[PDB]
């Protein structure tokens with residue numbers, strides 16, 4: 001069947017792995033174990049149509065930034081994740097989008113701006129600012145919590161819908 | 167960049183950080199199972215030697231390999 005290569009990118013600690021494992025295994029990862037790179041494949045039904053998700057969970061650690069080229073070339077949709085309590089991670093979003101352009105010649109690839117950890121009371125990134133950033137990119141903004149599962153399916157499934165509608 | 171080993175599993179791959187090549191294959195297996203499956207028995211195989219379980223008490227260095235398959239003991243790669 002049809003397989004979609006989705007890639008989860010963003011700064012250290014924003015919750016890329018927790019989002020991925022919440023989707024794949026319906027489980028919240030409490031501990032922090034830094035990622036180098038991991039992939040997870042799962043069959044899912046989106047809008048009544050079965051497909052295979054191939055999710056690439058990537059390193060926020062800049063030590064591994066050279067990997068970006070490989071996976072940005074073949075990635076078919078991207079979750080650009082920041083944490084709502086981490087303004088630096090929001091600032092970092094642009095760098096991921098720009099690197100995707102270096103290898104795709106464009107940023108014309110399905111992407112979702114993901115503001116994660118929305119279960120936390122303290123927010124340093126304003127919702128209107130995240131909405132405005134997504135608007136400046138022409139992409140959706142979705143608030144998620146890998147802990148409560150809020151918005152998680154919406155974030156990943158929106159990518160698949162955007163690929164299907166090309 | 168740290169050293170790391172590539173683990174090929176039933177539903178994807180995991181890059182497993184190692185501090186040095188004196189780490190045991192048992193330690194690598196436990197890390198890969200924890201990450202990929204969370205809380206069935208498993209073996210590791212050298213990428214270039216299918217169907218043979220590596221000695222989990224041996225060191226990564228002794229394997230002369232940096233890619234392994236994680237296989238359920240009741241199954242094949």
Ligand SMILES: Nc1nc2c(ncn2[C@@H]2O[C@H](COP(=O)(O)OP(=O)(O)NP(=O)(O)O)[C@@H](O)[C@H]2O)c(=O)[nH]1
Nearest residue numbers: 012013014015016017018030034035060117145146
């Ligand atoms: N409260 C809350 N905590 C979260 C959420 N997502 C992740 N975390 C926590 O934040 C920490 C880092 O999460 P993790 O998924 O490992 O982040 P990462 O972006 O994958 N880090 P790296 O880039 O090094 O791989 C973990 O302790 C995790 O429990 C969330 O939505 N809500």
Ligand SMILES: [Mg+2]
Nearest residue numbers: 016017034035
């Ligand atoms: Mg991670």
